[PDB]
RNA sequence: GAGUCAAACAGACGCGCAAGGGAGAAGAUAUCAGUACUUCUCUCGUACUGAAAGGGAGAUUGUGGUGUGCACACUUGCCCAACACCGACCGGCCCCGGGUUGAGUUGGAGUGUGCCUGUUUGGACCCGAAAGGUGGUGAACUAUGCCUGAACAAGGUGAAGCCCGGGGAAACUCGGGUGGAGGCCUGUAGCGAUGCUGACGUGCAAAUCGCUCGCAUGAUUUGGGUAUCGGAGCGAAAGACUCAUCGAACCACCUAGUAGCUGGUUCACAUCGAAGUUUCCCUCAGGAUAGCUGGUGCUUGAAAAAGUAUUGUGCGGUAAAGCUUUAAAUGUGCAACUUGCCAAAGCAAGGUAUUAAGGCACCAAGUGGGCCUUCUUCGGUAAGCGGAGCAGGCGAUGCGGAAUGAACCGCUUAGGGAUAUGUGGC
RNA sequence: AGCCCUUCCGAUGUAGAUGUGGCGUGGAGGUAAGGACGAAGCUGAUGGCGUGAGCCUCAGAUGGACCAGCCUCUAGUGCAGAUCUUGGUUGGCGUAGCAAAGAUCUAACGGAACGUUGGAUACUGGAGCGGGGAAGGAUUUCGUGCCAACGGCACUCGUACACGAGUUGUUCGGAUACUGAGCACAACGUUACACCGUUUUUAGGAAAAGGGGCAACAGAGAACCUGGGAUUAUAUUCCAAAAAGAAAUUGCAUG
RNA sequence: ACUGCAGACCGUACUCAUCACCGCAUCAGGUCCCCAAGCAUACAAUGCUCUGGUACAUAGAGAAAGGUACACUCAGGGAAGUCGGCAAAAUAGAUGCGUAAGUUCGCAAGAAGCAUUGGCUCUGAGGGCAACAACUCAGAACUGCUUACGGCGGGGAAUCCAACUGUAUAAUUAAAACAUAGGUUUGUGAUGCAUCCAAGUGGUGUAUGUCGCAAACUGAUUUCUGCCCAGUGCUCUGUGAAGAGGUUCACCGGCGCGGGUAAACGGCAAGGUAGCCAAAUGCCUCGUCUUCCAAUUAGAGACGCGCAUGAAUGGAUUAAUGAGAUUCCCUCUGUCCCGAGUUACUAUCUAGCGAAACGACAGUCAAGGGAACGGACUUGAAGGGCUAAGCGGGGAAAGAAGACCCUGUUGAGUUUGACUCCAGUCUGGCUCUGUGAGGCGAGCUUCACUUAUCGAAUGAAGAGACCAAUGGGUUUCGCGUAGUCUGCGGGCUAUGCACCGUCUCUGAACCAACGGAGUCUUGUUUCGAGACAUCUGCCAGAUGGGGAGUUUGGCUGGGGCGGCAUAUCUGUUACACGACAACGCAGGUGUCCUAAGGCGAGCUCAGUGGGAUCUCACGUAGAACACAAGCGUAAAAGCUUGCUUGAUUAACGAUUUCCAGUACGAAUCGAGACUGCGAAAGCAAGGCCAGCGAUCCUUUGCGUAUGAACAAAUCAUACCAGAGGUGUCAGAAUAAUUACCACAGGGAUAACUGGCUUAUCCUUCGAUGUCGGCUCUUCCUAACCUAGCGGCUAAGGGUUGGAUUGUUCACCCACUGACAGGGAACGUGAGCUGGGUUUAGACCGUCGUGAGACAG
RNA sequence: GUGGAAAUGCGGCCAGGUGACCAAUCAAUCCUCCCACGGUGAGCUUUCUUUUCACCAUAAUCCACUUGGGCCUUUCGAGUUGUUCGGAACGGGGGCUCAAGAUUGAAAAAUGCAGUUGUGAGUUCUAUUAAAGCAAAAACCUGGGG
């Protein structure tokens, strides 16, 4: 056959992410001593657009812990993050929005962005616009709160783990249709050559699995297995069920 | 410019020695990669057989016998070689003296070499694929991404916001302007490229020209830079593009790849001269096999002669006949003392017409598409049709004749002359 | 070229086989011989010989120095045909054409005979057959001469030929001296192997917190302007003391 | 401030283009940037002009046919032309009016549609700055028109498709395809998902984090997406024993079932729902009806026995959009009737210059024959030679070892549930792998531990302790208690002392004023997991077109399709020895039988007839003899019956058939043994004749041999004799597809082309351009009209224009005197046209698991 | 160091700024173009033509010093062609300051040219889509602190 595209972003050539214009990763603060025994105030100084993202980006400045210099640090913003809002990272800040607090001491059922999973891991769970996590209960015997992922998906982390309080900002965007093949073409300008999506049915057989044939049609089923090996893995992957649900 | 070189076999022919032949590597010497010389070995052979352990051949001072058998001898002998038949014997295998088996033996024929031919293998007579592999080179064309720059006339329509007004209980509508929106419109530039299926079409051009046309504020066009490629890259996906190369680039190499296929294969003359069929083959465009043919002989000379009769003796079941049976013609075959059986020594067996050189061996080629016709048929509605039988032809062959004709007719053929003819004519 | 004679029979022939004191070629061992009184080669109404391949002789008003015979050895040995290879030549054929973008005319001169100037006439028509640059080219530039060849006609002319010239910078651009998509040395790791990968390195990278470098002649950066009577050809580069001049700017130093 | 000195490197010419670059060139092609006038004008459109540049594109003369054109004009008609309004014409600027359906309310729209427009002399309007400037609009008279630059939309009504803009086969396809938004679905919480890499503390999505990413399908909106989970896919649920040992036997170690899923593949297990249609999907078929016309294979609209529609393999419907398909209309026109005239450049003739293709040889015909359509031959008929311009009939003209087709034990691309595999994935074991506490069972798991390991974070930036031990022992090294031990020095276990050990809704901040700022360390940077694995390595199993290599028999009146005539038997073909062919003809064959074999004996049968299964007669085989057929057979070879195993062994006997005089098979004559039957001779080593098979290997038997230093046992091997099988039957182990395709050939072999016949395969595959039309000529006559007769003669001349459809053909409308049939390579493509056929693109239906196929 | 009530004027590290990032438009200059005037040269000139054409130039550098914006101060309107704005300070008076610009002059008439200004137009430069938000960095600057 023929290299078929799956294979080919693996390359990560062309299939790259842009980034030049990115301000660099979104995380939170290096999780100090001062995040394990206080807090640290910064204030948010600008909440920048990120191309190719949706949340915008805080640019809290937290002045450093041990010298002289001041450290800008860079974080995806919970909604009402303003300009001049005064960040307080650390155990025993207050629990309030922007507030990046440990998990085990935010309230339970209590909404919370940019949590991170691994303690001092710098913020990995509900990074994407109008997404949050509820604490959906502590266990201060073992230490490990659980939460609910964006996804309706439960997890138990630890309570060291740092979250941030509230929904991240941005949220709905994918509410407004986009309209023009145009429109699409510039949200991932600022992504990936991920678009446009030309369907395997319409490519060739080298090309894909479906491709080929003179009806355009897959000959045999979309679900393909969770062991296909790559080239083979197209079309409905380990799918458990198929159909509208 | 195209059967070569090597090597391994074989037959034939030449040479050497011969129950042996020969060296090779190497050496030693004398004088020049030669010639001369030789040890020691090795090698093929003289012994074969069996899987193997193993065993291993003379007869009753000499052909094992017998049959047919040159020459010579003598008026039949001996028979050379040779064939055949049979012993015995060696090995192996058995049976209960017998069978049988070997590439055995039976007064060695091998060997080295030259040379030709044949087989094989190698580039393998020469030339030719589509490919396969190995490794490199390419994103200047072009595909895509990114960086960083550049570009886009003149119109048109006229969105949101805004501003003024009229109406309304309110509800928020109706004018009018404003504004300049949009993968908006017309249309430059630019980017394309629909149509004329226009020009051109050995062109200006290995894709161009003309007019027409499409997009032309956008998913736009564009420079530079940069990233991603060969079982790979890149693709709004046409297997498109990846330097005029892409259903797998290009370069080099393996590689003179392979070809049962196509094409070619160079002096003369003389001597003979086919086959297109048999069996076998993943065989059907090819082989092997046998036949046909050549060469070499060998062997001896009405030997085992015969595409023919006659005569004698078989065979037959087609035509005709007949109502599935009698039976042609053309054919076809053939001929010219010792030791079993018996009751026993008698039987059995082995022994004292025309014409014409016969047989045998070896090596080897081409061929293995046939065609026509005669007669006979089979299949087909029929055919310049498919299939067979017979014989003859063409193929491979003219010549004479049928005006003409591959195969009809006559006749078949060295270079010529006379004569006379053949078919055909006058 | 059969030792001679006599008689008899045969004679075609594709594929193929075979024969041949058969032909012929390059070379070798021999022999014999030839050649500047002309070898080979080549030419040939030069005949002669041979069935033939061919040989021989003659003649060159050809050549200029080698070489035939014979026996033996050898082979890279004989060619009308391979859409054969290579070179040359040919018919077609003085033909097909040299028809895209409108265009020249005139006189004078030049010249051995198209140019030059004047005039006339048009054209381009500022998205130009204009004036500068990148890429690319790299002497094409300029002058003199030349026009053999080339400029598909012609040339007196040329981007052609030959000869001689020509490109001037504190400030232009570039580098010195930015970063960018990116790249990759180092180290480290992987690999049978570094010609791989990360791009910092399980890592002691300071020599007086995160190694070194590169990567933009359109991005960032960037101190200079005009006048010239200054060239055949360069000028924001040349100019000379009244620098035509006027500046800005960097370094050091100086009062 | 000044002044003084110094200010280095390289670039620098020219070009930047119908002659300086790339394109083999001074090539009409391509190639980034900058500056860019005047007038008309809305203008960078277009035309023209100053400046700057050009006058270089070979020229001349003249003005045959035919051409090219970025040239026109054409009476009357007006699409009749054609496949098709192709091409041309036509519209056109501005202003004022006016503007339909349909619609997603934006549009459609420049809809459509009328109307006015010049010149001139005037008027009006519209501003600035203080105490002169535009130039548009408007109006008015008067007057003019030859309707007189350039430039500038033709319009409308419908159907199909796609929503739209976009992309896209560079060099035949710009589409309806791709994209698209929108829709759905799948995976997935980072130990991830997809995925690159030979490999790694490697890489991509991921600079990310479910509003994300990765994978698929559908394809805007509106509307709807029915039924089917049966298939398929996806998903989910070492240890013992024997043995001397090799070894052998045994025990434990992801599937099956079961479930779910169709916006999985698909069907309509379920039986096609809503819809929609002779639709790009309907064979029949030009369906039927209606509408459109004079006429309609067209179209539109209905209908729905739908060959073979139908629902994200999306269904339907859709305004806007469209160089998309299609029908019609108005306008318009040289498309046409039916051509004519003009132009300019060619051609023509000249000066200069100067190829190519092609080239066997040539080159008048008719007939003939012939490789079956001759330029060479036979026989006729022509023909003096050489020319110039045309021309396109022939030269089966040239082009290229036919892209078609077939062949080859040739390729490549693709597919796959072909064969063989290989990565990937997952699972398992082991290993990595330590330590404590358990329990269970005869080293297994729970549980903690932590130093391996793993993950994470970090610029290794603050861990634990001091709060004190089922803790430590070198300045703490030591004591005391009981138990035991002793190298007499102490040890060790328990244990307690000590000691290790101890302190408290954006401001600014540093560069310290022994400490200030705690000390300590059986150390780990921290955090997490933790002997698990997000770990290593190795084996294992499954999966695995993701990839790879390979194959995908033959024959065959081409191939495929089947058949199999691919091995064998009978009758026939077959022609009175033997042999003899055809996808020739009729049948058979792979078996079957302990008997249906062997033997003996007895017997007689099929059927007919006479009587009542029987009885008698006759009874030439008309029956039976496994099996098709032939043969043969009567006290039998049949039938019953009895006894039986000769269907054994058979020393390598010879032979026949096939034949090569090889084999296999089959069979015949034998000999030896031992039998069987029979009084006996005799008969029997199967059932006559078809019923079956190498090498290698396996296996079984049998009677010694080898395992080569020796020996025995085991094992293995060997000899020898059977068996397992190659049915393609003298024996590889083998799926499709290619229209994206390719090569070597083939006229050995299709379509095609002539011939023959009424299909053959003769020519042609190093190529002879297809149907049709148009155009033009020509010939025939089984005469349609005309003519003469009375159906016959008669080939003379003529035989129409249109609608549908590529057509031919047919059918229609109209005319006509009539609208005849044919030949000429189904006349005529270096004449055209290119509608049909029509390669690649794409869509639909059906077929196919798929790639792909369909003479739809 | 220093003036000013103020806006502000003059004389290691750390943080910020410049670098630095938009189509258009509007405005100013620039430039080109036109016109008017005036000069100068040339040309037409049968006739006509107070005429037609050309030219009338002003470099960087420096020195003195109207439009747009920011700000200081003082005691419903404001605003644009345009989608604004105002007690978080609008308007008015005075002031500050930036950015362009004008004029005064130095350069510089010793140059250019050849035998003048002004006026009009154009050009020039200095929001929208956005699920798009439209580089970096050295250099350099300024500060805070020393
Ligand atoms: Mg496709
Ligand atoms: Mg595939
Ligand atoms: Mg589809
Ligand atoms: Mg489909
Ligand atoms: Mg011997
Ligand atoms: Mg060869
Ligand atoms: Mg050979
Ligand atoms: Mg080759
Ligand atoms: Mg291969
Ligand atoms: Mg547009
Ligand atoms: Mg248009
Ligand atoms: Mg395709
Ligand atoms: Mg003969
Ligand atoms: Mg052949
Ligand atoms: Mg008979
Ligand atoms: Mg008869
Ligand atoms: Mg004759
Ligand atoms: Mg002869
Ligand atoms: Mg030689
Ligand atoms: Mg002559
Ligand atoms: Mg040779
Ligand atoms: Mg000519
Ligand atoms: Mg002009
Ligand atoms: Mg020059
Ligand atoms: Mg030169
Ligand atoms: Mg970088
Ligand atoms: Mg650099
Ligand atoms: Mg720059
Ligand atoms: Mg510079
Ligand atoms: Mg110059
Ligand atoms: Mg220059
Ligand atoms: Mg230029
Ligand atoms: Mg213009
Ligand atoms: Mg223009
Ligand atoms: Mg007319
Ligand atoms: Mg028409
Ligand atoms: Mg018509
Ligand atoms: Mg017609
Ligand atoms: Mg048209
Ligand atoms: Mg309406
Ligand atoms: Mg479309
Ligand atoms: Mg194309
Ligand atoms: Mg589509
Ligand atoms: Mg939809
Ligand atoms: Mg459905
Ligand atoms: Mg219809
Ligand atoms: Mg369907
Ligand atoms: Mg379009
Ligand atoms: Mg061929
Ligand atoms: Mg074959
Ligand atoms: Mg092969
Ligand atoms: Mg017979
Ligand atoms: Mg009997
Ligand atoms: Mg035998
Ligand atoms: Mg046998
Ligand atoms: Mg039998
Ligand atoms: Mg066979
Ligand atoms: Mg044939
Ligand atoms: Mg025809
Ligand atoms: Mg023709
Ligand atoms: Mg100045």
């Known amino acids: 056959g023929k290299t078929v595209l799956t294979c080919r972003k693996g390359n990560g050539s062309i299939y790259q992410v842009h980034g030049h214009k990115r301000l ?3 995380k939170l603060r290096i999780l100090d001593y001062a995040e ?7 204030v948010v100084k600008t909440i920048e657009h990120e191309p190719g ?4 980006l805080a640019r809290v400045e937290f002045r450093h812990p041990y010298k002289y210099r001041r450290v800008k640090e860079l974080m995806v913003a919970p909604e009402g993050m303003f300009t001049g ?4 990272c650390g155990v025993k800040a207050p629990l309030a929005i922007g507030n990046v607090l440990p998990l085990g001491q935010i309230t339970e059922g209590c909404i919370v962005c940019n949590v991170e999973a691994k303690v001092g891991d710098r913020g990995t769970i509900a990074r994407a616009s109008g997404d949050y996590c509820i604490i959906i209960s502590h266990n201060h015997e073992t230490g490990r709160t ?3 992922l964006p996804s309706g998906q439960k997890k138990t982390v630890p309570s060291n783990c740092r979250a941030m309080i509230g929904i991240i900002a941005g949220g709905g965007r994918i509410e407004k249709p986009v309209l023009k093949a145009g429109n699409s073409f510039y949200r991932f300008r600022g992504k990936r ?3 446009p999506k030309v ?3 319409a490519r060739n057989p080298v090309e894909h699995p479906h491709g080929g044939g003179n009806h355009q049609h897959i000959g045999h089923p979309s679900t393909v297995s969770r062991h296909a090996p790559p080239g083979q893995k197209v079309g409905l992957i380990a799918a458990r069920r198929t159909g509208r649900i």
């Open 53 to 56: 993202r949706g949340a915008p």
């Open 24 to 26: 660099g990763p979104a």
């Open 85 to 88: 809002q005064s960040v307080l």
């Open 146 to 148: 659980r939460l609910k």
């Open 199 to 201: 369907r395997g049915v």
């Open 193 to 195: 050559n991920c678009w």
């Open 36 to 42: 394990r025994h206080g807090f640290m105030r910064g």
